[PDB]
Design a protein around this nucleic acid. Structure first.
Ligand code: CL
Ligand code: MG
Ligand code: MG
Ligand code: MG
Ligand code: MG
Ligand code: MG
Ligand code: MG
Ligand code: MG
Ligand code: MG
Ligand code: MG
Ligand code: MG
Ligand code: MG
Ligand code: MG
Ligand code: MG
Ligand code: MG
Ligand code: MG
Ligand code: MG
Ligand code: MG
Lengths: 96, 203, 177, 189
RNA sequence: UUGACCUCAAAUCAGGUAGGAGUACCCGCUGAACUUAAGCAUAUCAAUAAGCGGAGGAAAAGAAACCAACCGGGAUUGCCUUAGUAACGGCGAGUGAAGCGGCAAAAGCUCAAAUUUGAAAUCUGGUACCUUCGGUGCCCGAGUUGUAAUUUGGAGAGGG
RNA sequence: GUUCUUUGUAAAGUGCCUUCGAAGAGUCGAGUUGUUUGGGAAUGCAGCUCUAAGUGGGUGGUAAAUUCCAUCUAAAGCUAA
RNA sequence: UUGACAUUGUGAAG
């Protein structure tokens, strides 16, 4: 991660004596805690499953995991959120 | 505390328990007047994070507003202009339905100040909102340091000028290159960019 | 309208309340641990660790929920009349998870009158005097058999679906002929 | 309206521009007002220097990174290294910027030195209220100017290894261009 | 029978508050056409005039879900500049910002989300008195479906 | 500048060790329609439909899959020149 | 005017 010392190339830039700043607590905003993990687990067993989540579970058992992502992408937004949702449904299926 | 559980449970809007509650409550709201006083918040957890406190001087109102687009109110659809302005049906109001509900409650109680509002329910015809209002004349508010800023005359009819949370979003009051048109006010920015500046010793 | 529709099990569990005989004994024990009134507060303050350790009923939704999560509540009373039902709808599951016995009792106004409030919506006992240990254990066994031990089966049962008086007669008539 | 050999003009005057003409007739008047405001603020506020001490920072961008200028405020780490707290620093006339970070040791050392010199050249009056009269210096920036750091000595010896600088630039440029394609070939094999 | 609670009403009930005017400047909504393109419909005029709602001595914005790609900068506003530039456009007529750099002015902050639980510690009103932009005692009421103290990410909290 | 009250077994700041560290939902985001912008596989705003996550989320000015990196901390609020 | 989605739940058969 050191600079080469010249104005062009991969690690272009001037060499200076590096320092490590203290980590900022705001960088851990999305970090799970013991309190919030307990609440979310308790709510899931109370509320149950959404109608589109039930259809996703059926597709995993009957039509494979690949088609579940295609449907999950349509109900959700981006493709990255569909992958996370499918993995969440797999854990629910596994713990049964 | 129970507020943490309420926050997470409110996010499961399509669960069986919340579907039952939303069907019963939407019927009850439809039977009441379009604007009516609410005895207590329906979502106490949501009210607290928007600034509500359970003390004298805080008032909750419930309001019902019609959904859909804004039909251009011209007779028989005639616009009398160029074809680019002949649209009538597919036009959209530039302010949200939440703002419309907030403004109408403000006129009903002109002695109060609107703090915030939140969504509660909706059907095909209507959306339902609850509005938080503060009494600027009550001594429990005027003697409280955290809330007596609302008593300043500069904060009269905040919802009419779009100074509330929903008003600032519709105005595009945000930072970054995405909001270059409306960072400091769209019309103020336009005036600055369309002004001819001349000095005594011409440049 | 709330009884014509099918009630989900999470809400339907609140239709079962403590019976009159055991509820009367429940309030008899709780009435021995009333919080001190403002008048009793004044005499205590002017006398003042010159005071003995107090024993009183714990109340307050945020206060009681924290007590359950820390394994400190020995018995929790739940009102069935909370109009924003979400405030208390999760308590039976939370108590079941933490192993704290609970009872759905009839009347938020009645819970309030034992804590000098108009309404309370929740009450709990954390520490009881030695002379009342036997009474508390007898109540817990009776209360557990009605709510805690039946939680698994109640969670699977839907409520509601009751027809009106005239609709019931019409259906019964068609079934007979 | 096009004739003769003339440049193409782009004068933007097709709106109601005459309604939005701003002539600065009050340029001299505003200078008098600003000087009056500075004079009345200096007398009103304190024998304080009318401005806060600022740190020295590196200007961003490859076009301006060769110069140092005044930043907004000293970092939390910089004020801690000087032996004071952020809350107390603000009341003594030191600007504190909590969102700036330290990654350069040279900049960090320079800002620490500035804080040391500032504390040695000021007198903090006690809160009792004695407040002996002192001469008011109107500019802390003038008292503590910012200087460009030295880079090299005036003359040295010629140390040539025979390698061409032009060749070095070409090879470094070529290495970056083909880095991705070469890695793919190695991965495939 | 009696007494609570919840919700909903009434009173020339006790005390308050809103309307209208002004509107140069300020915050929003709504919204043209003449005109230009040598015709004309997209475009342009213009996110303008007219219409409607709402403030102040300023308003608004404001302490980053920012800019950057640098050895990084560091709330907002304004001036000089960037620049008639990147870009948009029957790519026609025309339109058109932003980062950096210099300067003016500089100022920072707090709620929600935690059990005071060996003590609702909080507050409106009434009444008596007083050193009256308020204070004290007392009495009802609000409030546990949460009023104070404590902590707002730069952190911070429980123990030693 | 002088003077009357001790506020207070009050309040605040600073070192080291250990366990923790709660952070805003019909919202973000996505599709579509209209309007708007210099913003161009779509700059902002709004209607309808769908509707999240917690080592997460937004942004990095050409759509997409995959692998990294940088940078901030939205959906709550006040504030002179 | 026609279709789709939302409003939109409950039970049975072909
Ligand atoms: Cl808030
Ligand atoms: Mg940060
Ligand atoms: Mg009266
Ligand atoms: Mg404006
Ligand atoms: Mg023409
Ligand atoms: Mg002509
Ligand atoms: Mg013509
Ligand atoms: Mg006008
Ligand atoms: Mg005035
Ligand atoms: Mg001014
Ligand atoms: Mg202001
Ligand atoms: Mg911040
Ligand atoms: Mg800035
Ligand atoms: Mg234009
Ligand atoms: Mg428009
Ligand atoms: Mg890119
Ligand atoms: Mg594109
Ligand atoms: Mg503001």
């Amino acid at each position: 991660t050191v600079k080469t010392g010249i104005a062009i190339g991969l690690n272009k830039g001037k060499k200076v004596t590096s320092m490590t700043p203290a980590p900022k607590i705001s960088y851990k905003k999305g970090a799970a805690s013991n309190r919030t993990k307990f609440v979310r687990s308790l709510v899931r067993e109370i509320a149950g499953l959404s109608p589109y989540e039930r259809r996703l579970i059926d597709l995993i058992r009957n039509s494979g995991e690949k088609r579940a992502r295609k449907v999950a992408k349509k109900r959700l937004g981006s493709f990255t959120r569909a992958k996370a949702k499918v993995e969440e449904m797999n854990n629910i299926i596994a713990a049964s | 505390g129970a507020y943490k559980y309420l926050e997470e449970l409110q996010r499961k809007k399509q669960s069986d328990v919340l579907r039952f509650l939303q069907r019963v409550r939407v019927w009850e709201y439809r039977q009441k007047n379009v604007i009516h006083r609410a005895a207590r918040p329906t979502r106490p957890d949501k009210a607290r994070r928007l600034g509500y406190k359970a003390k004298q001087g805080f008032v909750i109102y419930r309001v019902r507003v019609r959904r859909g687009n804004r039909k251009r109110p011209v007779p028989k659809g005639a616009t009398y202009g160029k074809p680019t302005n002949q649209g009538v049906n597919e036009l959209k109001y530039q302010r949200s339905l939440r703002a419309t509900a907030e403004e109408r409650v403000g006129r009903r109680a002109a002695n109060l100040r609107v703090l915030n509002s939140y969504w509660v329910n909706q059907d095909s015809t209507y959306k339902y909102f609850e509005v938080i209002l503060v009494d600027p004349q009550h001594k429990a508010i005027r003697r409280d340091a955290r809330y007596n800023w609302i008593c300043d005359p500069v904060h009269k009819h905040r919802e009419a000028r779009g100074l509330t949370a929903t008003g600032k979003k519709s105005r595009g009051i945000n930072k970054g290159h995405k909001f270059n048109n409306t960072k400091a006010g769209r019309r103020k920015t336009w005036k600055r960019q369309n002004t001819l500046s001349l000095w005594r010793y011409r440049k | 309208l709330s009884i014509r529709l099918k009630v989900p099990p999470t809400i339907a569990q609140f239709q079962y309340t403590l019976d009159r005989n055991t509820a009367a004994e429940t309030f008899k024990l709780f009435n021995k641990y009333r919080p001190e009134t403002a008048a009793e507060k004044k005499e205590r303050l002017t006398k003042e660790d010159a005071s003995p350790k107090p024993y009183a009923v714990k109340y307050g939704l945020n206060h009681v929920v924290a007590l359950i999560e820390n394994k400190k509540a020995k018995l929790v009373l739940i009102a069935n009349d909370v109009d924003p039902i979400e405030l208390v709808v999760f308590l039976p599951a939370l108590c079941k998870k933490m192993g704290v016995p609970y009872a759905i009792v009839k009347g938020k106004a009645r819970l309030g009158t034992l804590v000098n409030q108009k309404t309370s919506a929740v009450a709990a006992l954390t520490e009881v005097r030695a002379e009342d240990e036997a009474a508390l254990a007898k109540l817990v066994s009776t209360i557990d058999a009605n709510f805690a031990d039946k939680y698994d089966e109640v969670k699977k049962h839907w409520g509601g679906g009751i027809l009106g008086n005239k609709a019931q007669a019409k259906m019964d008539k068609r079934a007979k002929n | 309206a096009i004739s003769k050999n003339l440049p193409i003009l782009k004068n933007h005057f097709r709106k109601h521009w005459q309604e939005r003409v701003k002539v600065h007739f009050d340029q001299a008047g505003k200078k008098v007002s600003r000087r009056n405001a500075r004079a009345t603020r200096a007398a009103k506020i304190a024998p304080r220097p009318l401005d806060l001490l600022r740190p020295v920072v590196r200007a961003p961008t490859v076009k301006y990174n060769r110069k140092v200028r005044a930043g907004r405020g000293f970092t939390l780490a910089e004020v801690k290294a000087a032996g004071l707290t952020a809350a107390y620093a603000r009341t003594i006339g030191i600007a504190v910027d909590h969102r700036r970070q330290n990654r350069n040791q040279e900049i960090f050392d320079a800002n620490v030195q500035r804080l040391k010199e500032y504390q040695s050249k000021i007198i903090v009056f006690p809160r009792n209220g004695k407040a002996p009269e002192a001469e008011q210096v109107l500019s802390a920036a003038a008292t503590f100017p910012i200087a460009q750091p030295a880079t090299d000595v005036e003359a040295r010896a010629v140390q040539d290894n025979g390698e061409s600088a032009f060749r070095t630039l070409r090879l470094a440029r070529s290495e970056k261009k083909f880095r991705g394609i070469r890695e793919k070939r190695a991965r495939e094999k």
